[PDB]
Design a protein around this ligand. Sequence first.
Ligand code: FES
Ligand SMILES: [Zn+2]
Lengths: 295, 193, 54, 77, 86, 119, 168, 52
Amino acid sequence: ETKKPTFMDEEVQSILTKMTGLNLQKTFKPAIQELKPPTYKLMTQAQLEEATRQAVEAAKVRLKMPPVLEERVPINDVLAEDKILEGTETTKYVFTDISYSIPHRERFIVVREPSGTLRKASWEERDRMIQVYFPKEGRKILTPIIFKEENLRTMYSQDRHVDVLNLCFAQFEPDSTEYIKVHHKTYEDIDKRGKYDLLRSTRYFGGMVWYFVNNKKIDGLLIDQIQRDLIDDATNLVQLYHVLHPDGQSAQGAKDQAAEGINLIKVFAKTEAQKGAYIELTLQTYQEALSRHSA
Amino acid sequence: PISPYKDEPWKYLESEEYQERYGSRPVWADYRRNHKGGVPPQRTRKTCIRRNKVVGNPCPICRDHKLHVDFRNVKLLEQFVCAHTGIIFYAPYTGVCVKQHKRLTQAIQKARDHGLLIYHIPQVEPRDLDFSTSHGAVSATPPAPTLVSGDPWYPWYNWKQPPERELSRLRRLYQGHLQEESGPPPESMPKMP
Amino acid sequence: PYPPLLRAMIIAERQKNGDTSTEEPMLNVQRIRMEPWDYPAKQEDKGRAKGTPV
Amino acid sequence: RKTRHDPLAKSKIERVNMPPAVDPAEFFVLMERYQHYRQTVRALRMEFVSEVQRKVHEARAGVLAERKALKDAAEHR
Amino acid sequence: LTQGLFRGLSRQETHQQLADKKGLHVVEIREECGPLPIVVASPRGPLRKDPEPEDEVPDVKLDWEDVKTAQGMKRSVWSNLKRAAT
Amino acid sequence: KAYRGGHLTIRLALGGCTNRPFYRIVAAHNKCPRDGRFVEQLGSYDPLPNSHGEKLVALNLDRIRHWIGCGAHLSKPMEKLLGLAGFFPLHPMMITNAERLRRKRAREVLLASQKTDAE
Amino acid sequence: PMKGRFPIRRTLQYLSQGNVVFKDSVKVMTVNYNTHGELGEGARKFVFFNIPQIQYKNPWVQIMMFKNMTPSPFLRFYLDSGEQVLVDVETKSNKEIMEHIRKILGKNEETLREEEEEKKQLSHPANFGPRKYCLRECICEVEGQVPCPSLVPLPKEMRGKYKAALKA
Amino acid sequence: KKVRPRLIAELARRVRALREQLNRPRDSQLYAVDYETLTRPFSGRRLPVRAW
Ligand code: FES
Ligand SMILES: [Zn+2]
């Protein structure tokens, strides 16, 4: 019938890509790591334009937004129950098929409990064993202590939200509960303190827009874009909101009035936006300043 | 010597007694080792304090009892880390003893675990190419018949009492070397009350 | 029947390849003719004691 | 360990290892378990043996393999 | 040693002189900053429209000491030693 | 090296330090030393429980099925690891050793009960 | 400095830049070039720069050179089946020659990646052993597992010295 | 690479194999048994207790 666009649709990818923008200075910020003496080349105006172009192609590969998944379902499956083995052992065995040419989500990992029950390993146990025999740089077997409440607040206080997302992407899987909680908590702190610029020109901006839209918290973001002369992104945010929520006061009103450009913000501001008054004032200031420049 | 900054060591670096002694340079700047030759030993002394007794030329950490190596004193731990590569200097670089260089590396790694010290965190790639849990390994498997009826996987797991004619053969086969016949085992494992 | 794990890995290949079936995988033990341990062996392939009288 | 030429000890000269006692019930039940267990494993072994024979013959004499050997020879000409 | 040190440190060509000499952009490539081209110097005069002819093999005299190190062949128990700060 | 006769076997190769054993599953010739030369490594076994209280066992099933199809044998401890996993059936003596333990513990409950009852 | 003209040729970084990896058919490569003549200029540069690159990638291939035997230069390959591949290289640069033999007798990029991929499967990360072959030697290097006794002494209840004493 | 011949290693090998065929023990010597000590006098080995 009518399916609502997903996070990986070409239409949504292009919208979230444009909002993110491209900033080479922040995308390729000098890393604090082991250094080497740089290399120099004598280039022309055209050779410099091509090199700057190849950096744009490589930055769009570094800004690739990770896919957004739903919380994976627990694993509760028993392969066999051998009651004769009950009481013969004190601890449980964890068998792990280790074959190189197998994806880790198709890999068999079972557990023989002391009750003789041969079940499948839980998600927490699968991801742990896959790191013992197929280690990955950045991931640790034991959950770090940085992802705790008190420690995460410290990182937020230093405006290191992109660091928390990079730690979470290297330690947890996209469909894990911790990957979702840590991401969602970070998104809620930005909206509270208006730090939307931090995630700009990164691969974590789209996922942040996708969370506010589905939970209807685009008021703060929509304001920031207006305060930065980014109306094109501000209008695309309302267009996206209407798509995912067709049966909304703003969506229905827009169709009736056929609002376009700045009008969409006004229609959405009064009907559905919680901070309708503040938006109109902010949008008002911008439109006045824009008129002066046009003169 | 009882330092007043024992519990709050970060207050000594932001005081005037620290500025009048070190200034803006690190604590290990005006320190030189006493060794024979131009090339120094590749290891520093184990410790500058032996049974509450300090050596003639203590290291930058052992000479000032008000400098406490804690994971909270971020301003002191930054003097032992390169601001361009984020690498901890080896002891011969600064001149600290092995005992304090082992305490700094821990405190420096404990502050990076609490988010107090800034360090480079790369942007890694995903572990898996696909994210589909459409496989038996991660999903439910059709319970086998024997599992639904509460039966063992193979019939010969359970005890089966053999005929009498077969025991007589064994008794005849092993005459004078026998053991008391054992009956069917209990259904479940006993426990000590 | 196949043992627990092997059975679970044969049913997953079916579903991965697309074949949909509810039949149980089972081992054909009819070929395996288990003979008793006291069955006469071959004496024409058996060795002999060496000539080292003690 | 010892060799054939090394002699025997004087403490093992008058030694007789008596066989263990037999439980008629357990002995018979356990004598059938090995009979089935070993029959179930003899079939598994034959299965795996057929898979190693297949792949080898497939590799040197297969459809895909012979479909690529002709493509490489046709591209050479 | 001293008369030669001051001699080579005074006859070194900067990035600005090089650009003016060849009328081309001097771009800096760093591994830490990825493929981003950093312009360190540009000519004040007319920028040339033709590029430098790419050379298949450069006829530049090498130093066996540097080539022997890059190939993991210069063994020495005195190099890369831990020393004090300088 | 060439051994007279012999065959390939999938056994356990002890490792680790004193009071800290760590076995590594390997396919090696029958006459070769325990911890000597091997053909391939097919897994590992850590007897000592970890922090989570679980014993880890790695198995390269794809390769264990290859060597069993090439003429390789199995050792008793290794046949008991494949039965605990579900790859092989429960070894007959894994079952009988459990029955012996049951009768043994039921024989101790009597004496314990009699003492508390009689005395 | 390094002796000889164009010393960069005698470097591992330059010898590994060759992109001509012959197939299994190629067994012998014979080069016939003239020392003089404008037409044979490229053949001389091909013997001065690239033959080192070709022989380094194909060490089991015999390469024999002949001077001033014919009025014009040419290449000739001898395959294992008995077939000969004549290649006139007159009025051509060394790059055209290096690119031409790569198309008729050299392997493509698809055939190379495959071979490399096979090697990656020879070093299983799960395996434990010496640093030369494996990443980890023992499983005590894995956090969570019991550490080595050399670093962290084991509990008195887990040592065979006291297990025997406690029992007797 | 020219191995130096070992002729005595081949001479004795032939002699041993020959003597094993001319001095071979018979079934009367090999499989004899003393019914009091229950030992084969040829090798002086006791039979298993279950065969006595
Ligand atoms: S090396 Fe792993 S236990 Fe000693
Ligand atoms: Zn000290």
